[PDB]
Subunit: 215 residues, 2 copies
Amino acid sequence: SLRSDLINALYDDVCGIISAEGKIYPLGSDTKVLSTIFELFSRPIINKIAEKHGYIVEEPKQQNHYPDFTLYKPSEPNKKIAIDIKATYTNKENEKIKFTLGGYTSFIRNNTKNIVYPFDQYIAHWIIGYVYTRVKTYNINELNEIPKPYKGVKVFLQDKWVIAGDLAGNIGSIHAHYKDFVEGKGIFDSEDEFLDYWRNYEKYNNISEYRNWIY
Amino acid sequence: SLRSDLINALYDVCGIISAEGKIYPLSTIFELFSRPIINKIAEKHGYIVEEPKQQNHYPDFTLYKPSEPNKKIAIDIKATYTENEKKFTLGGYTSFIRNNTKNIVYPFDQYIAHWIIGYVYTRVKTYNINELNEIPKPYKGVKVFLQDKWVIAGDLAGNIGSIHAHYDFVEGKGIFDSEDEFLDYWR
């Protein structure tokens, strides 16, 4: 399985940005730089495991476009995997955390807008999450002093719908603990249910209401 | 002159470095570069800086002397690219400028100045400290400027597009006659 191999490759970080002159600038939990920093560590991994399974990998040449990684065996080109990399922080190790998962007004509702390949062609939508515990340049010899943005990184690979939640922030994911994301304990019964909730989200506001609405 | 001190004080990065010494080859970066500089000069003048607490909120940096809240300065870190040739975008012309209390940190009427810090670069496996030379750069050459929003703004988006001139920007060379004509166009 590309999937079990892949996730077990993720199971086994940043000091700052480095210049050509070897000068290092710390980053320290200041803003969105950490999502770009996270996808960077993953690109190599997604690539070695795919290759060792005969899978192509691809990225949105047209920059802003879903998903970060499109995978597929040339033989059966029509079954494509969507792999998005999301990241979130936790100030308290062992507290519940949240993620954002992409828009619901575009490709989930249109089919073609803002996606690398048409939605109908992807058979799986995986999510790679990192939960990192929140906590004048430097030399190459100062790596162990440079004020790090976080201390501890956790990752999980889970299908998108499984962890999707019922509240917008751009879809918000469930509000659970690291374990619930790994375990796969979301709130939707089927992905059919997840698609229908988010496509019709113009009646209902949360899952109870929703399920009543389908009556 | 905080505009002076700032400009005076006002970019080569080719990778991110890991704890294990490894280096990963590469607009958030320029953001990250300005922050440290913006703050050291302002503390040198007595301004408290404040970033936004939500996406899409003007401005990137609001600065003020606590005793004069209606004399805050807004700064916007803007960055684009060329190799040497022929344009930025400038927030939105629908919100805080016609509203005042929307999509902005403070009411537009508290800002007695708006600026833009512009960076115009030129575009184009892991390595280690010795391999540092072999790391292909992300951008060839980087230029920087600060100028008000009204001095370099004009036609339309295609946000709200600035002029399409040659790094002019530092000289002001824009098309509007004043900041009243600037607003009286986009409003």
